[PDB]
Structure formats: C-alpha cells, structure tokens
Amino acid sequence: CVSMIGGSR
Amino acid sequence: CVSMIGGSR
Amino acid sequence: CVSMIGGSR
Amino acid sequence: CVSMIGGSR
Amino acid sequence: QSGQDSGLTAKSQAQQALNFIRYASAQVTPPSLPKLSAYSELWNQATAKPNS
Amino acid sequence: QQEIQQRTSDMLTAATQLVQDWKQVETQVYTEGT
Amino acid sequence: ILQKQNEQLAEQKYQQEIQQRTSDMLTAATQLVQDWKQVETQVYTEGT
Amino acid sequence: QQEIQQRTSDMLTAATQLVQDWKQVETQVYTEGT
Amino acid sequence: PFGAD
Amino acid sequence: PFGAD
Amino acid sequence: PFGAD
Amino acid sequence: PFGAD
Amino acid sequence: PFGAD
Amino acid sequence: EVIDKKAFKDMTRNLYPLNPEQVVKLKQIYETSEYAKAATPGTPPKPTATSQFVNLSPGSTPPVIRLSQGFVSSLVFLDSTGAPWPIAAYDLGDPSSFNIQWDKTSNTLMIQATKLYNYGNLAVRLRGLNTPVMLTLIPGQKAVDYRVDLRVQGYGPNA
Amino acid sequence: RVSIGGTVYTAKKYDD
Amino acid sequence: RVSIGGTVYTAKKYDD
Amino acid sequence: RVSIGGTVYTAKKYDD
Amino acid sequence: RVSIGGTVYTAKKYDD
Amino acid sequence: VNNDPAFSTTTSTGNSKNDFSAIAKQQFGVPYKSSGEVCTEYQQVCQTWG
Amino acid sequence: RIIYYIQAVIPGRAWLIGSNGSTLTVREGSKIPGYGMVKLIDSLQGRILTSSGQVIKFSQEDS
Amino acid sequence: RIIYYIQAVIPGRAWLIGSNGSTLTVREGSKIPGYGMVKLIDSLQGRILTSSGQVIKFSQEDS
Amino acid sequence: CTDAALAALEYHKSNA
Amino acid sequence: CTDAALAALEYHKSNA
Amino acid sequence: CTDAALAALEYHKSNA
C-alpha cells in the first residue's frame, strides 16, 4: 500500500 | 549519496 | 592544477 | 623573444 | 573555321552542332537563381533553431 | 524582486534542455562480421 | 491610507496563485495520464 | 575625442582580416609518380 | 526521500 | 571543487 | 606570459 | 626599420 | 477505497 | 602617437575580449558543469556477471534480470550440461521499454533498457522446448547483469 | 550539496 | 591563474 | 504519503 | 618592440 | 516596458493563456470607488485602484 | 599485504586493481579485504578513504 | 647519473626522453628517478622544476 | 575538501 | 615567472 | 642600432 517515494521524514 | 561536484570548501 | 597561460608576474 | 621588425631606433 | 571573334563561336562542324544543341536547349538563358538579401533572410530564418 | 523572476527564467531555459537531453536514450548498434 | 490600499491589493492577490498552479497542473497531469494510457504491442521474431 | 573610437573601428576591421588570414590552413597535396 | 539511502 | 586536485 | 621565455 | 640594412 | 487493501 | 596606444589596448579588449585567464576559467567552469551533468546520482549499480538455474516446473518463479538505461545485458542460454541452447524465437512484452537484438542463429539475446526502471517480461521459445522460457526484466536495480548464464532444466541439441 | 532524496542538506564550513 | 574547479585563487606580486 | 484507493493518510513527524 | 609574453617591452632611445 | 510580452526578448514558453493582453501579462488596473466598484466616471468619487 | 590502486573511479562506483591482478568495484559502503570499509569516494581527486585510515590512490605508474 | 631532456610538454603532462632512450610521461606530482619529485611544468619555457633543484629543459640539440 | 564531504555525509545520515 | 606560479600553487593547495 | 634591440631584450628578460 505504502507509496514511499513520496516520503517525508 | 554525496555528489562531491556539488561540493564547496 | 595551474593554467600558467593565465599567469602574470 | 625580440621581433626585429618591431624595431625603433 | 575562325568565325566571329569575342563570342560563342564554332571552329568546326562539330562545334557548330554543339552550338546548336546548346541553342535549342535554351542553355544560353539559365533560370533565375534567388537574391542574396531575400533568400538570405529567409535562410537564417528557416535554419534557425526555434523557440530560442 | 524582478531579478528573481529573470533568474528563474534563465533557470528554466536551461532546465528544459537538460531534461530533454536526459530523456534521450540511443539504441545500440549492431555490426555482424564477414 | 496608502498602506490600507496596498494591504487590500495584497489580500486580493492571494486567490489566483492557486488557480495558476492548478493550470500548470492540468499541463502536467494530462501529460502523465496520456503517457500512462499508452500500451505498446508485443513484438515477435521468428527464428531462421 | 572621436579619434580614438574611429581608430579602434578601422584597426579592428583590419585586425579581423589579419586573424582570418592566419586561421587558414592550406591542406597539403600528394602527387604520385609514374 | 529517506536518509538511509 | 577541492584544493587537493 | 613570463620573462624567462 | 633599421639603419644597418 | 478501504483500509484493508 | 599615443592614440594608437589606447586604441590598440581597447581593441585587444574587444576582438579578444576573453583574456587568456578568462578563456581558461571559462574552460574549467565548462568541465565542472558538464561533469556534474554527466555524474550519475547515487552509486551506480554494480556490474555483475551471474548465473541462474531456470526451473520450469509449475509453481516455480520466473528468473529475474537486472538491467539499466543504455547498458547491454547479454542473456546466454545453456541446458543442464551447460552447452549452448539456440533460440527458436522470442517475444518481448512492451518493447517500448526494452530493445533486444539477437543475431538470428545464436543463443544470446542482448537487451537495453529504454525507460529507466519500469519493468516488463519476456518470452523466449527455445529450440527443443515446447515450454517457452519466461523472464522478468527489471531495470534500474542496484546491480546490472552484464551477463547471466541461465541453466535451463532440460537438455539441448548440444550434449 | 544535494542528496538523492532531493532534500538539500549542506555542510557549513570546513577546510583542509 | 585559475584551477579546474572554477574557483579562482591568485598570487599577489612575484618577479623573477 | 498516499494509498491506492484515493484517500490520503500521513504520519505526523518521525526521524531515524 | 613587443615580447611573446604579450606585454610590450621597449627600449627608450638607442642609435648607432 | 518590462510588463509587455513583446519586449520580453527571452523566448518564454510560459503561460500564454493568462496574459491580460498581447501587450501586458498583468493589467495596471482601473480607478475604484471607495465602496469598491468600477469608477467609470469621475462624478462618482474614485479613491482606490483595482 | 596486498596493495590495490584505482583502475577508474566515477561518482559512486570505483573500480580498483590490486597487486594480485584482482579487479573489484565498490560503492559508498563496501568491505575491502584488509582495507576495512570504505568511507568516501573522491572521484575528482581519484581518492578512496576507508575506515582503516589508509587512502587508495591511482598507481604512481598509471596516473 | 642519467640525463633526460623534454621531448614534448603541454599544460599538465610532459614527455621526457633520457640518454638511455627511455621515454616517460609526467604530471604535476610524479616520481622521477634521481631528480626526485616534480614541482612544476612550465610548457612555454620548456622547463621542468623538480624537488632536487635540478631544472629539466629541452635538449640543446633539440631546441 | 574531504572534511567538508564527511561532515556533509554524516549530516545527511543524521537528518533523514 | 616561476615564483608567481609557485606562490599561486601553494595558495591553491592551502585553500581547499 | 642593435643597441636598441639588445636593450629591449634585456628589459624584457629582467621583467617577468
């Protein structure tokens, strides 16, 4: 599910 | 990770 | 490193 | 280094 | 043969034939090639990379 | 304030040609021997 | 007075930036979705 | 005061001719024997 | 974008 | 750009 | 441009 | 421009 | 759109 | 006569306005810019030449190939004894992502990725197999398969 | 200096 | 005098 | 961060 | 007279 | 002079559909009465800009 | 020990050649036998720094 | 000792020929037997300064 | 040179 | 001549 | 004559 390219730390 | 040509003393 | 054509006394 | 045509007495 | 001087002339029968075939071909009147100035602006206009 | 948007203009008039040279991927060539 | 009016112009300003970013997003999003609907047919090669 | 810039213009029109005159490199010829 | 790349 | 080039 | 040319 | 030419 | 996907 | 002097100094400032110092520093600015240009961000994937065993039993998973943008991955097909297994034919899914060429007799297919990491799949009907060999191509991984020696489960015309 | 995450984290001042 | 990185450092005055 | 259905749920603040 | 360093160096006055 | 697109010597491929006119991307504006409507005629008092 | 020299280097991977003829390729973090673990790859200086404090350079006879 | 003379020199590398006929190419930092460690490349003067104070020039019969 | 780079990389690791 | 070059290269290798 | 030539020569040789 997790689209981690749109990551925010 | 480091782009050293993006480097500055 | 030195471009001595860019030299000057 | 000396260009004699560039001479002036 | 030494025909008229200072012009397109035939020195021989073969040269008379050659002169005539040039003549009927209208090779003495070549088509008009474009101008310097006009074609030139159109050139630098056409071959210029657009949007820059 | 205007120096900023002129800055950004010249940024994009560089960045668009960088991006277009990066989509360029040239196909391999083949040479078969005699 | 002058301060009041340029404050009001600034207040009115802060409504169209969203719509211009929205238009830029039309240019971006349609191009992505057009990229995405593209399917390219599989190619077959028969050996010698 | 006009003399200096008219001078620069004429000497530069000359100098462009000279630099073009040196930039030329006339390729050598090869002549075979009989 | 994470830092353990 | 580094000084140990 | 040096004087030991 | 010499004189011993 | 559910959370059990 | 000094008009000659300042006129000449001014023109040497105009026709050759790039000083010898300026020509070289513009040079250096050039290579720094186009080096940071050409410099691939992150580490590049490691170039490896590997070897996989291709199992075609039901339930087995298709073998994988790591590829990269503009680099050649050479897939050579061998049977159980490791002898060459020529290709009957091949079928690339989405060749808009992938360009494979193949000299029409050999047992090698050589593949370039055309868009960076979008992955696809490939069918390769070999000579003696009723069963085609199906291979999953993923580009942009942390390794690039310069070659892989895939050992098909069967026996080829070379024993 | 910029990383591959896109967030630009930079060193401040260091000489050698 | 300029190095390859683009940064310019120069000597002050030196005669030979 | 965004799911596949369309709804957007996002973690607040964390670091590693 | 001019040198090949690019800077003009001349004598003052000399005859013979 | 900076507001006119024809004077933008830069070959800008930006938003060409939002310019106010062919001669200005952004309008200067018009006089506006104190209440806040178009001050077409001087007879009604014109105070602000819009 | 076995001394290696740089064979080539770009941002990220660096290919190095040892005295035994072995050729390897490395990234930001990798295990080099004896050399430990590489801390930095200075491609424009042709320099590799690893945890053991020593520095990998291009060979004197090929740089 | 063995005497070399410059057979070519440009900004950076300098190609040097010896009295034994050996050919070498050097940079700013290069170990040169006898002379030691190269200090600078002077391509327009045809000059090479090395750490031992010795100055390497174009051969007198070659300049 | 290298000290700026190592401080940068440790700052990048510290702030993910 | 060479004095300027040496001072310059020292100033370059001293300032990163 | 050549006095001017050698004077300019030594003037160029003395000034780097």
XYZ file of C-alpha atoms in Angstrom:
676
model
C 0.000 0.000 0.000
C 2.716 2.438 1.056
C 3.974 4.625 -1.763
C 7.273 5.564 -0.043
C 8.775 7.525 -2.875
C 6.562 10.326 -1.632
C 8.478 10.067 1.624
C 8.656 12.769 4.280
C 10.990 12.372 7.237
C 24.900 9.783 -1.524
C 27.335 12.689 -1.713
C 27.641 14.437 -5.074
C 31.084 15.874 -4.488
C 30.991 18.105 -7.559
C 28.136 19.621 -5.640
C 30.927 20.397 -3.197
C 32.310 23.538 -1.586
C 35.090 24.084 0.948
C 46.092 22.443 -11.468
C 47.737 25.607 -12.762
C 46.961 27.049 -16.170
C 50.103 29.152 -16.415
C 48.936 30.861 -19.602
C 46.689 32.505 -17.047
C 49.923 33.651 -15.462
C 51.092 37.129 -14.518
C 54.266 38.407 -12.866
C 61.650 36.974 -27.987
C 62.838 40.022 -29.923
C 60.995 40.847 -33.142
C 63.449 42.982 -35.103
C 60.746 44.208 -37.495
C 59.168 45.732 -34.407
C 62.277 47.874 -34.193
C 62.598 51.578 -33.462
C 65.971 53.293 -33.110
C 36.982 27.775 -89.334
C 37.542 31.003 -87.390
C 34.116 32.593 -87.005
C 33.198 35.841 -85.281
C 35.593 36.944 -82.559
C 34.657 37.645 -78.932
C 31.627 35.408 -78.636
C 30.322 31.872 -78.560
C 31.680 30.631 -81.881
C 32.282 27.322 -83.643
C 35.711 26.412 -85.019
C 34.461 23.274 -86.786
C 31.378 21.398 -87.957
C 31.227 19.512 -84.657
C 31.356 22.809 -82.772
C 28.525 24.132 -84.951
C 26.500 21.087 -83.926
C 27.400 21.664 -80.265
C 26.474 25.348 -80.510
C 23.084 24.494 -81.992
C 22.237 21.843 -79.407
C 23.055 24.346 -76.686
C 20.939 26.827 -78.600
C 17.732 24.799 -78.956
C 18.121 23.632 -75.352
C 17.942 27.347 -74.404
C 21.032 26.759 -72.280
C 22.186 30.295 -73.152
C 19.436 31.609 -70.831
C 19.744 29.895 -67.443
C 16.915 30.224 -64.911
C 16.999 32.995 -62.324
C 18.531 31.918 -59.013
C 17.309 33.840 -55.925
C 18.691 37.017 -54.373
C 21.382 37.391 -51.757
C 19.332 39.527 -49.388
C 15.890 37.961 -49.795
C 16.880 34.295 -49.826
C 19.432 35.149 -47.137
C 16.967 36.420 -44.549
C 14.683 33.515 -45.415
C 17.664 31.189 -44.866
C 18.759 32.442 -41.463
C 15.064 32.429 -40.619
C 14.434 28.841 -41.768
C 17.523 27.115 -40.354
C 17.428 28.933 -37.007
C 16.581 26.698 -34.072
C 13.083 27.763 -32.963
C 11.987 28.898 -29.503
C 15.478 30.221 -28.732
C 12.179 41.477 -6.884
C 12.326 41.282 -10.680
C 15.901 39.991 -10.677
C 14.358 36.895 -9.093
C 11.963 36.049 -11.900
C 14.593 36.786 -14.534
C 16.812 34.387 -12.592
C 14.063 31.734 -12.691
C 13.512 32.365 -16.403
C 17.134 31.594 -17.172
C 16.956 28.581 -14.826
C 14.116 27.097 -16.845
C 15.674 27.995 -20.201
C 18.485 25.768 -19.000
C 16.485 23.094 -17.165
C 14.210 22.266 -20.106
C 17.170 21.394 -22.316
C 18.734 19.357 -19.509
C 15.506 17.372 -19.140
C 15.240 16.860 -22.891
C 18.780 15.533 -23.116
C 18.010 13.137 -20.270
C 15.008 11.561 -21.965
C 17.380 10.766 -24.845
C 18.360 7.087 -24.832
C 20.053 5.997 -28.049
C 19.540 2.469 -29.341
C 22.519 0.117 -29.500
C 24.066 -0.559 -32.914
C 24.982 -3.981 -34.292
C 27.842 -4.967 -36.602
C 27.984 -8.568 -37.803
C 31.293 -9.900 -39.046
C 32.306 -11.052 -42.503
C -4.473 55.150 3.709
C -1.898 54.140 1.109
C -0.908 51.330 3.474
C -4.566 50.319 3.706
C -4.952 50.088 -0.069
C -1.821 48.078 -0.829
C -2.731 45.724 2.020
C -6.093 45.269 0.297
C -4.400 44.598 -3.048
C -2.190 42.017 -1.338
C -5.295 40.452 0.224
C -6.979 40.216 -3.182
C -3.748 38.829 -4.661
C -3.811 35.670 -2.518
C -6.522 33.917 -4.535
C -5.156 33.485 -8.066
C -1.869 31.753 -7.250
C -3.861 28.589 -6.532
C -5.584 28.732 -9.919
C -2.367 29.329 -11.859
C -0.726 26.388 -10.102
C -3.911 24.490 -10.982
C -3.490 25.303 -14.685
C 0.151 24.221 -14.561
C -1.185 21.020 -13.028
C -3.525 20.498 -15.970
C -0.494 20.709 -18.256
C 1.339 18.167 -16.071
C -1.421 15.697 -15.163
C -2.881 15.268 -18.639
C 0.608 14.603 -19.987
C 1.188 11.925 -17.337
C -2.147 10.214 -17.963
C -1.510 10.236 -21.715
C 1.872 8.614 -21.056
C 0.061 6.054 -18.926
C -2.751 5.048 -21.298
C -0.092 4.174 -23.887
C 0.322 0.434 -24.342
C 2.770 -0.781 -26.974
C 2.151 -4.069 -28.759
C 4.413 -7.028 -28.039
C 6.719 -7.930 -30.930
C 7.571 -11.443 -32.115
C 10.549 -12.552 -34.218
C 10.615 -15.979 -35.875
C 13.967 -17.722 -35.997
C 15.767 -18.739 -39.157
C 37.652 62.512 -28.555
C 36.097 60.890 -31.639
C 39.564 59.993 -32.941
C 40.117 57.086 -30.549
C 36.921 55.176 -31.335
C 37.153 55.797 -35.077
C 40.703 54.473 -34.761
C 39.535 51.386 -32.891
C 36.916 50.690 -35.555
C 39.289 50.894 -38.528
C 42.138 48.993 -36.891
C 39.653 46.312 -35.784
C 38.264 45.949 -39.299
C 41.865 45.391 -40.352
C 42.623 43.022 -37.464
C 39.659 40.767 -38.221
C 41.062 40.397 -41.741
C 44.512 39.518 -40.391
C 43.233 36.938 -37.907
C 41.204 35.317 -40.663
C 44.369 35.417 -42.795
C 46.192 33.376 -40.159
C 43.365 30.967 -39.281
C 43.647 29.429 -42.759
C 45.474 26.110 -43.071
C 46.053 25.006 -46.654
C 45.997 21.211 -46.827
C 48.972 19.576 -48.494
C 48.787 17.792 -51.832
C 50.027 14.311 -52.696
C 51.308 13.764 -56.235
C 52.162 10.193 -57.206
C 54.869 9.138 -59.616
C 54.687 7.450 -62.990
C 13.377 10.655 0.271
C 14.897 8.978 3.328
C 18.388 9.301 4.765
C 19.423 5.638 4.860
C 19.941 5.566 1.075
C 35.856 21.925 -6.493
C 38.526 20.901 -3.964
C 42.033 22.168 -3.263
C 43.651 18.719 -3.362
C 43.073 18.325 -7.116
C 53.310 35.258 -20.043
C 56.674 35.056 -18.252
C 60.029 36.806 -18.536
C 62.061 33.607 -18.899
C 60.666 32.713 -22.336
C 63.206 49.840 -39.585
C 66.996 49.607 -39.249
C 69.952 51.673 -40.431
C 72.497 48.881 -40.918
C 70.303 47.192 -43.548
C -11.047 2.664 -1.143
C -10.765 0.709 2.123
C -8.076 0.345 4.773
C -7.845 -3.448 4.458
C -6.271 -3.322 0.978
C 51.111 58.717 -31.296
C 49.502 57.594 -28.005
C 46.102 57.455 -29.733
C 47.488 54.322 -31.358
C 48.300 53.100 -27.842
C 44.890 53.423 -26.196
C 43.038 52.454 -29.380
C 45.094 49.258 -29.577
C 44.546 48.449 -25.903
C 40.803 48.957 -26.330
C 40.631 46.711 -29.386
C 42.633 43.955 -27.718
C 39.940 44.255 -25.064
C 37.225 43.855 -27.732
C 38.295 41.403 -30.510
C 39.971 39.084 -27.976
C 37.856 40.149 -25.004
C 38.315 36.748 -23.355
C 41.650 37.208 -21.621
C 43.950 34.157 -21.511
C 42.964 33.914 -17.835
C 39.310 34.197 -18.849
C 39.486 31.548 -21.582
C 40.869 29.007 -19.134
C 38.500 29.782 -16.286
C 35.570 29.527 -18.711
C 37.092 26.184 -19.734
C 37.157 24.980 -16.129
C 33.618 26.187 -15.490
C 32.666 24.132 -18.554
C 34.043 20.822 -17.324
C 32.769 21.287 -13.768
C 29.290 21.988 -15.122
C 29.196 19.140 -17.617
C 30.842 16.721 -15.171
C 28.121 17.389 -12.610
C 25.902 16.995 -15.670
C 27.222 13.535 -16.606
C 27.592 12.367 -12.993
C 25.021 9.654 -12.190
C 23.318 10.458 -8.858
C 23.791 7.875 -6.150
C 26.009 4.971 -6.608
C 25.696 3.282 -9.990
C 24.569 -0.343 -9.862
C 27.338 -2.901 -9.521
C 28.223 -4.630 -12.832
C 27.881 -8.366 -12.232
C 28.031 -11.451 -14.441
C 25.790 -14.031 -12.774
C 24.228 -17.439 -13.412
C 20.722 -18.668 -12.577
C 19.045 -22.068 -12.751
C 15.822 -21.887 -14.771
C 13.174 -24.188 -13.300
C 10.064 -24.618 -15.454
C 8.063 -26.817 -13.077
C 4.607 -25.432 -12.194
C 4.872 -23.257 -9.101
C 8.436 -22.158 -9.870
C 9.047 -18.462 -10.246
C 10.449 -16.909 -13.426
C 14.113 -15.900 -13.304
C 14.917 -12.208 -12.975
C 17.296 -9.942 -14.892
C 18.633 -6.645 -13.538
C 19.205 -4.110 -16.315
C 19.941 -0.394 -16.677
C 19.447 2.565 -19.010
C 21.523 2.193 -22.169
C 23.566 -0.801 -20.987
C 23.669 -4.206 -22.650
C 22.574 -7.309 -20.759
C 23.591 -10.459 -22.634
C 21.382 -13.467 -21.911
C 23.053 -16.732 -22.932
C 21.018 -19.939 -22.744
C 22.539 -23.267 -21.707
C 20.979 -26.632 -20.934
C 21.670 -28.706 -17.822
C 25.081 -29.739 -19.181
C 25.900 -26.062 -19.784
C 26.015 -26.405 -23.575
C 24.515 -23.698 -25.811
C 20.767 -23.793 -26.473
C 19.843 -21.843 -29.637
C 16.665 -19.776 -29.800
C 13.654 -20.764 -31.863
C 12.007 -17.337 -31.417
C 11.286 -14.611 -28.882
C 8.508 -12.248 -27.803
C 9.167 -9.061 -25.841
C 6.390 -7.556 -23.766
C 6.389 -3.767 -24.121
C 9.433 -3.238 -26.385
C 8.736 0.469 -25.885
C 10.617 -0.127 -22.616
C 13.226 -2.530 -23.936
C 15.300 -3.079 -27.076
C 16.599 -6.630 -27.543
C 18.662 -7.623 -30.544
C 19.814 -11.095 -31.488
C 21.851 -12.452 -34.378
C 19.294 -14.820 -35.715
C 21.180 -18.109 -35.186
C 22.905 -17.692 -31.827
C 21.757 -18.487 -28.293
C 22.155 -14.944 -26.916
C 19.652 -12.099 -26.588
C 21.140 -8.682 -25.771
C 18.839 -6.184 -24.102
C 18.932 -2.415 -23.438
C 16.512 -0.589 -21.158
C 14.858 2.446 -22.753
C 12.933 3.888 -19.793
C 14.610 3.865 -16.520
C 13.074 1.337 -14.121
C 9.644 0.317 -15.435
C 9.825 -3.458 -15.560
C 8.495 -5.952 -18.049
C 8.506 -9.583 -19.070
C 9.861 -11.645 -21.953
C 9.047 -14.967 -23.632
C 11.776 -16.971 -25.388
C 10.775 -20.111 -27.283
C 13.944 -22.210 -27.394
C 14.820 -24.891 -29.948
C 13.821 -28.151 -28.272
C 11.311 -26.909 -25.702
C 7.578 -26.982 -26.083
C 7.863 -24.827 -22.957
C 8.892 -21.200 -23.579
C 11.317 -19.593 -21.142
C 9.731 -16.609 -19.402
C 11.997 -13.994 -17.833
C 11.217 -10.893 -15.782
C 13.251 -7.818 -16.750
C 13.665 -5.089 -14.131
C 15.866 -2.067 -14.925
C 17.293 0.459 -12.503
C 18.164 -2.038 -9.773
C 21.201 -1.824 -7.512
C 23.013 -4.307 -9.775
C 23.305 -4.621 -13.547
C 23.533 -8.089 -15.091
C 26.198 -7.619 -17.732
C 25.631 -11.338 -18.345
C 23.681 -14.177 -16.764
C 24.226 -17.861 -17.561
C 20.749 -19.357 -17.139
C 20.817 -23.164 -16.900
C 17.543 -24.436 -18.288
C 16.233 -27.607 -16.657
C 16.146 -29.567 -19.928
C 18.681 -30.964 -22.391
C 19.506 -29.202 -25.643
C 20.738 -30.303 -29.064
C 24.281 -29.962 -27.669
C 25.123 -32.589 -25.058
C 25.284 19.948 -1.679
C 22.234 17.831 -2.580
C 21.490 14.152 -1.943
C 19.467 11.656 -3.985
C 16.440 12.215 -1.765
C 16.038 15.743 -3.164
C 16.245 17.451 0.205
C 19.334 19.656 0.112
C 21.473 19.105 3.206
C 24.747 21.029 3.207
C 27.914 21.180 5.239
C 28.611 24.601 6.743
C 32.351 25.416 6.592
C 35.297 23.001 6.532
C 38.843 23.474 5.233
C 41.914 21.278 4.828
C 45.546 31.847 -12.556
C 42.512 29.555 -12.233
C 42.222 25.892 -11.247
C 39.925 23.306 -12.823
C 37.170 23.532 -10.206
C 36.322 27.072 -11.359
C 37.361 28.776 -8.125
C 39.990 31.445 -8.771
C 42.990 31.923 -6.484
C 45.860 34.220 -7.455
C 49.296 35.185 -6.235
C 49.838 38.837 -5.322
C 53.145 40.013 -6.848
C 56.194 37.909 -7.714
C 59.046 38.746 -10.085
C 61.823 36.577 -11.496
C 2.008 9.622 1.859
C -0.881 8.274 -0.243
C -2.737 4.970 -0.669
C -4.180 3.337 -3.797
C -7.898 3.893 -3.206
C -7.561 7.695 -3.203
C -7.728 8.615 0.481
C -4.620 10.331 1.847
C -3.296 9.356 5.284
C 0.059 10.634 6.517
C 2.300 10.114 9.534
C 2.900 13.279 11.548
C 6.590 13.559 12.488
C 9.296 10.922 12.971
C 13.058 10.628 12.461
C 15.708 7.936 12.035
C 59.192 46.201 -29.517
C 56.739 43.591 -28.180
C 57.517 40.290 -26.462
C 55.858 36.871 -26.605
C 54.546 37.192 -23.079
C 52.010 39.552 -24.674
C 53.199 42.561 -22.683
C 55.034 45.261 -24.632
C 58.626 45.859 -23.506
C 60.600 48.529 -25.367
C 63.940 50.263 -25.119
C 63.979 54.033 -24.602
C 66.410 55.519 -27.154
C 69.400 53.841 -28.799
C 71.166 54.644 -32.070
C 74.316 53.548 -33.892
C 8.354 48.196 -20.520
C 9.047 45.008 -18.562
C 5.317 44.220 -18.444
C 4.963 43.804 -22.214
C 5.453 40.249 -23.568
C 6.653 41.568 -26.937
C 9.502 43.259 -25.060
C 10.430 40.011 -23.313
C 13.374 39.217 -25.585
C 13.580 35.909 -23.727
C 11.793 33.191 -25.709
C 9.375 32.365 -22.909
C 7.135 29.315 -23.345
C 5.255 30.002 -20.100
C 1.561 30.663 -19.502
C 0.452 32.427 -22.685
C -3.248 31.903 -21.873
C -3.267 34.058 -18.715
C -1.810 37.314 -20.057
C -4.180 40.249 -19.705
C -3.499 41.289 -23.305
C -0.901 40.847 -26.036
C 0.881 43.946 -24.711
C 0.788 43.196 -20.980
C 0.562 39.995 -18.964
C -0.659 41.950 -15.920
C -3.109 44.840 -16.204
C -2.287 48.111 -14.485
C -5.839 48.419 -13.150
C -8.629 50.979 -13.047
C -9.911 53.565 -10.566
C -12.292 52.159 -7.979
C -14.808 53.995 -5.836
C -14.469 53.962 -2.058
C -17.152 51.266 -1.847
C -15.172 49.104 -4.266
C -16.764 49.161 -7.723
C -15.564 50.396 -11.096
C -15.227 54.189 -11.086
C -16.128 54.628 -14.742
C -16.890 58.352 -14.378
C -15.231 60.983 -12.198
C -18.674 62.111 -10.980
C -18.693 59.227 -8.526
C -15.677 59.557 -6.247
C -12.696 57.410 -7.247
C -10.330 56.544 -4.399
C -8.670 53.133 -4.777
C -7.046 51.084 -7.537
C -8.140 47.692 -8.786
C 49.752 -7.190 2.445
C 48.064 -6.759 -0.952
C 48.151 -3.162 -2.188
C 45.458 -2.043 -4.636
C 45.398 1.045 -6.849
C 42.495 2.766 -8.559
C 41.721 1.396 -12.007
C 38.989 4.012 -12.581
C 36.516 5.999 -10.495
C 33.253 7.895 -11.026
C 30.671 9.264 -8.523
C 29.561 6.129 -6.707
C 31.325 3.032 -8.001
C 35.104 2.876 -8.169
C 36.928 0.064 -9.957
C 40.231 -0.884 -8.331
C 43.034 -3.245 -9.353
C 45.240 -4.992 -6.804
C 48.766 -6.349 -6.956
C 47.373 -9.871 -7.465
C 45.600 -8.860 -10.677
C 42.188 -8.959 -8.998
C 39.719 -6.278 -10.080
C 36.862 -5.090 -7.874
C 34.162 -2.419 -7.924
C 32.993 -0.501 -4.858
C 30.276 1.913 -3.711
C 29.743 4.293 -0.783
C 29.874 1.416 1.696
C 31.676 -1.833 0.903
C 34.009 -4.357 2.515
C 37.553 -4.252 1.127
C 39.703 -7.149 2.428
C 42.229 -5.725 4.864
C 41.194 -2.183 3.987
C 38.045 -2.453 6.097
C 35.029 -0.439 4.940
C 35.172 2.477 2.506
C 34.043 5.812 3.943
C 34.312 8.071 0.889
C 34.964 8.060 -2.873
C 36.619 11.281 -4.075
C 36.345 10.679 -7.824
C 37.684 14.064 -8.943
C 40.803 13.534 -6.813
C 40.957 9.803 -7.586
C 40.927 9.171 -3.825
C 39.289 6.420 -1.735
C 39.086 6.826 2.040
C 38.298 3.728 4.107
C 37.825 3.098 7.823
C 41.394 1.830 8.372
C 42.682 5.374 7.788
C 44.720 4.480 4.696
C 43.842 6.020 1.329
C 43.562 4.285 -2.053
C 45.059 6.289 -4.927
C 45.744 5.744 -8.579
C 49.037 3.925 -9.005
C 52.134 6.085 -9.383
C 52.882 4.498 -12.775
C 49.393 4.871 -14.278
C 48.219 8.297 -13.052
C 73.664 9.800 -13.406
C 71.187 9.589 -16.291
C 70.197 12.778 -18.111
C 66.748 13.397 -19.591
C 65.523 16.144 -21.928
C 61.951 17.129 -22.728
C 60.659 15.574 -25.942
C 57.258 17.256 -25.527
C 55.435 19.386 -22.986
C 51.925 20.828 -22.720
C 49.875 22.034 -19.701
C 49.981 19.010 -17.415
C 51.817 16.020 -18.860
C 55.382 16.327 -20.110
C 57.015 13.591 -22.181
C 60.705 13.157 -21.373
C 63.460 11.240 -23.167
C 66.646 10.077 -21.470
C 70.216 9.459 -22.524
C 69.359 5.746 -22.382
C 66.487 6.400 -24.797
C 63.815 5.688 -22.182
C 60.542 7.583 -22.567
C 58.386 8.842 -19.700
C 55.293 10.984 -19.216
C 54.933 13.094 -16.076
C 52.370 15.312 -14.353
C 52.458 17.832 -11.505
C 53.002 15.031 -9.000
C 55.283 12.319 -10.355
C 58.305 10.462 -9.013
C 61.299 10.836 -11.332
C 64.428 8.771 -10.517
C 67.425 10.818 -9.435
C 65.635 14.155 -9.707
C 63.016 13.185 -7.130
C 59.575 14.796 -7.110
C 58.328 17.077 -9.888
C 57.392 20.550 -8.649
C 56.087 22.309 -11.750
C 55.527 22.028 -15.510
C 56.494 25.162 -17.486
C 55.287 24.357 -21.001
C 56.041 27.671 -22.736
C 59.582 27.945 -21.368
C 60.237 24.251 -22.000
C 61.071 23.937 -18.311
C 60.537 21.330 -15.597
C 61.269 22.082 -11.947
C 61.912 19.099 -9.659
C 62.493 18.883 -5.919
C 66.257 18.276 -6.183
C 66.623 21.801 -7.586
C 67.587 20.410 -10.985
C 65.920 22.136 -13.938
C 64.959 19.931 -16.884
C 64.862 21.632 -20.281
C 64.538 20.862 -23.960
C 67.656 19.249 -25.379
C 70.138 21.810 -26.664
C 70.377 19.939 -29.982
C 66.572 19.639 -29.999
C 65.558 23.230 -29.162
C 37.840 19.024 0.562
C 37.282 15.672 2.247
C 36.367 17.076 5.674
C 33.510 19.103 4.200
C 32.311 15.960 2.426
C 32.425 13.753 5.523
C 30.660 16.354 7.659
C 28.060 16.652 4.900
C 27.506 12.890 4.670
C 27.232 12.497 8.438
C 24.707 15.352 8.488
C 22.721 13.584 5.749
C 22.727 10.325 7.710
C 21.762 12.157 10.919
C 18.860 14.033 9.265
C 16.983 11.505 7.138
C 57.880 33.816 -13.736
C 58.117 30.661 -11.647
C 57.931 32.485 -8.302
C 54.384 33.616 -9.076
C 53.443 30.100 -10.201
C 54.858 28.557 -7.018
C 53.166 31.074 -4.722
C 49.923 30.523 -6.630
C 50.061 26.725 -6.418
C 50.861 26.912 -2.705
C 47.897 29.260 -2.215
C 45.717 26.826 -4.182
C 46.747 23.711 -2.254
C 46.420 25.583 1.051
C 42.863 26.836 0.373
C 40.503 23.970 -0.472
C 71.083 50.097 -33.986
C 71.342 46.684 -32.347
C 71.812 48.556 -29.064
C 68.071 49.232 -29.005
C 67.404 45.568 -29.800
C 69.565 44.165 -27.006
C 68.367 46.824 -24.555
C 64.750 45.856 -25.215
C 65.830 42.212 -24.966
C 67.364 42.652 -21.515
C 64.449 44.829 -20.390
C 62.052 42.014 -21.310
C 64.365 39.403 -19.768
C 64.542 41.320 -16.470
C 60.784 41.987 -16.168
C 58.883 38.703 -15.865
